[PDB]
Amino acid sequence: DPLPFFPPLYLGGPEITTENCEREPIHIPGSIQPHGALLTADGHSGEVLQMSLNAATFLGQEPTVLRGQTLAALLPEQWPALQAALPPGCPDALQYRATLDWPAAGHLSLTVHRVGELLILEFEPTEPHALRNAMFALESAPNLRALAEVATQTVRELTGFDRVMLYKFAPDATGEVIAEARREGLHAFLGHRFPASAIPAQARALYTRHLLRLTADTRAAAVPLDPVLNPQTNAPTPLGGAVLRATSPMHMQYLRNMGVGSSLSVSVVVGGQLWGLIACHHQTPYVLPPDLRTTLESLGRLLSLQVQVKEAHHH
Amino acid sequence: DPLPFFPPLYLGGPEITTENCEREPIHIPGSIQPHGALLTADGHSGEVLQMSLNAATFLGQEPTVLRGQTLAALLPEQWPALQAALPPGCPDALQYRATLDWPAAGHLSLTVHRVGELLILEFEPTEPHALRNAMFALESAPNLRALAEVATQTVRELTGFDRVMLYKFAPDATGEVIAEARREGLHAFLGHRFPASAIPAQARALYTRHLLRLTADTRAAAVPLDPVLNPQTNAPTPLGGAVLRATSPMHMQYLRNMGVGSSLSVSVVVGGQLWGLIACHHQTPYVLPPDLRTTLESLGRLLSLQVQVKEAHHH
Ligand SMILES: *C/C=C1/C(=C/c2[nH]c(/C=C3[NH+]=C(/C=C4\NC(=O)C(C=C)=C4C)C(C)=C\3CCC(=O)O)c(CCC(=O)O)c2C)NC(=O)[C@H]1C
Ligand SMILES: *C/C=C1/C(=C/c2[nH]c(/C=C3[NH+]=C(/C=C4\NC(=O)C(C=C)=C4C)C(C)=C\3CCC(=O)O)c(CCC(=O)O)c2C)NC(=O)[C@H]1C
């Protein structure tokens, strides 16, 4: 049970320190990472309610001009499908995904989820068999630690990340790196233990519900949403289900201090509890493409189940 | 433990009947389904050793002219990768996959696996997020039967198959349909039980090792390989790892008698034992594309693990 949140800084909340980091409202930063754009919309009317300030970079119309327009006008082809895919009351982790044309190279990937009566739309530029292959070595791994070793190697191979760790939580929420795949020459974190405060309780709770999060560029400034509050509620917009959610500034400083240029992790959830993380670092900024992120989510699921099976036959 | 095999018909084996069907050598039919082409090659030299007789339809050179040519000549780009992907001693279920250009519409999908010192190459014309989405309802299913119901619905949605069943094996190898998703108007098989002989012991044993098999057109005549025997061994070529493997004629007659035009199943393997099948029927011929088959293999894996978890919490 994490403490009550601070108000976010845009509601006059206090500054975060190492003495109160467990109270930062990381699920409502009111801003996104700059490598994509985000809109929110009324889940019945499809009226656009909020827009990231960088929307015209990705969507080609000004945020103030998009505001109030319907997704039926904006996304004629996708709106019926979107609407049917994400009915009121559906899980906030359920996603609608489509690919959109745009004047630039590649395409625009659209990812949508629903929170209450709000649709949250994420747009990012983009220019499974290996998963399938991997499941053999994951299945044949003789025990938990062997599974962990295979899993980190597989993820490195899929992603090209400089470092991939499987971080395991202890009952006191301290953690240990129990497996690591890394580029030659990088110093090892294998076996290193870290205190519970490295991943504070409100983060652990969010990561139990929304199983993948990332920081594409640990030096990139966040982009505010406008208006910052959801008009439906006159309250902050929950962004925990959006990969574009801005990362805690305190965690980004931690990553920079570590010499990390990009970070990504996937939760390993067993019996509804956070068991650990597949934790990835790159030395430079890196936008993992949406199809590869989807594959990592799927491996996270598969790994969660295999952990539960490998641990059981120790009983 | 299945009985010893009959020799295949091309080695003077006896005709199959309902009294001896458990002895049909289904893994070595010496022939393929006609919607693709197959080559085999020496795993060191890449010399082509065998060719399906229909190769020129898909590859544009005569089988007798391909024979003896190296994959380095035939597939310059892919051969180093192929070779590195499938080293001697690797699992015979491990696959290399690539997409090839050809003069026709779409592309040519290449799938390769290794059996001993033989590479087996399958070529078929072709013109994951839904998987990811599905895992939520699979995870939230409260028990085994609910999981089964979600799984058959998901597979129907992914594939558009007229009927999708989860067939569960009993300890005496009889089976029961414990879940079914079907097009409106189709009579139900839900709850129906079938004798052990419907899926004979040598089939059950193959399906424990090679987890997906299909009959794209239950009226299509098989296409012989040439030469029919692998020159390395002067013995039949094992095709259980090739989806293009010709289906037992006895099973194809069964499917036609059932009014099935296309069939596909995926094994559910738990603790190394065959627990059951995701069994799919279409009323007409249907070539499920290779990327969708790959997705079904991945769901089969995930379902196997979830079955094991849902059944355990009954203990
Ligand atoms: C008092 C505040 C601090 C704090 C806040 C914080 N930390 C996170 C999220 C993560 N911290 C992680 C820690 C590690 N990464 C590593 O590589 C290692 C060791 C090799 C450790 C211990 C990780 C993995 C995460 C998850 C995010 C990610 O994968 O990059 C948050 C939440 C961030 C967010 O989602 O917005 C916060 C608020 N961390 C501290 O150490 C103290 C100073
Ligand atoms: C004595 C020989 C017979 C026999 C041989 C046989 N059967 C199979 C494979 C399968 N049989 C299946 C049975 C069913 N499909 C259904 O829909 C239902 C009920 C609704 C049943 C009972 C299934 C599912 C398979 C797997 C293949 C597939 O999914 O289509 C084989 C092996 C075929 C092969 O891989 O080459 C053989 C030799 N089956 C009999 O009933 C007796 C007459």
From Swiss-Prot, chains A, B:
Where does the GAF domain lie? 143-307
Entry's transmembrane regions: none
> PAS domain spans which residues?
23-91
Q: Which residues form a coiled coil?
A: none
**Effect recorded for residue 251 to A:** 100-fold reduction of chromophore-binding activity
Outcome when changing residue 280 to A: Binds PCB (in vitro), but has aberrant spectral properties
Please report the PTM annotation for this entry: Contains one covalently linked tetrapyrrole chromophore. Lacks the cysteine conserved in plant phytochromes (at the position of Met-250) that binds chromophore. An engineered sequence used for X-ray crystallography forms a thioether link to biliverdin through Cys-21. The natural sequence can bind phycocyanobilin and phytochromobilin in vitro, but the identity of the natural chromophore is unknown.
Lineage top rank: taxon: Bacteria
Q: Which positions does UniProt annotate for a tetrapyrrole binding?
A: 21
Q: Which family does it belong to?
A: In the N-terminal section; belongs to the phytochrome family.
Q: What does the record give as the function of this protein?
A: Photoreceptor which exists in two forms that are reversibly interconvertible by light: the R form that absorbs maximally in the red region of the spectrum and the FR form that absorbs maximally in the far-red region. Also has a slight blue shift for the far-red maximum. Could also absorb green light. May participate in regulating pigment synthesis like the carotenoid deinoxanthin which could protect the bacterium from intense visible light.
Q: What is this protein called?
A: Bacteriophytochrome
Species the sequence originates in:
Deinococcus radiodurans (strain ATCC 13939 / DSM 20539 / JCM 16871 / CCUG 27074 / LMG 4051 / NBRC 15346 / NCIMB 9279 / VKM B-1422 / R1)
The top of its lineage is: Bacteria, Thermotogati, Deinococcota, Deinococci, Deinococcales
From the entire protein, which fragment is shown?
4 to 321 of 755
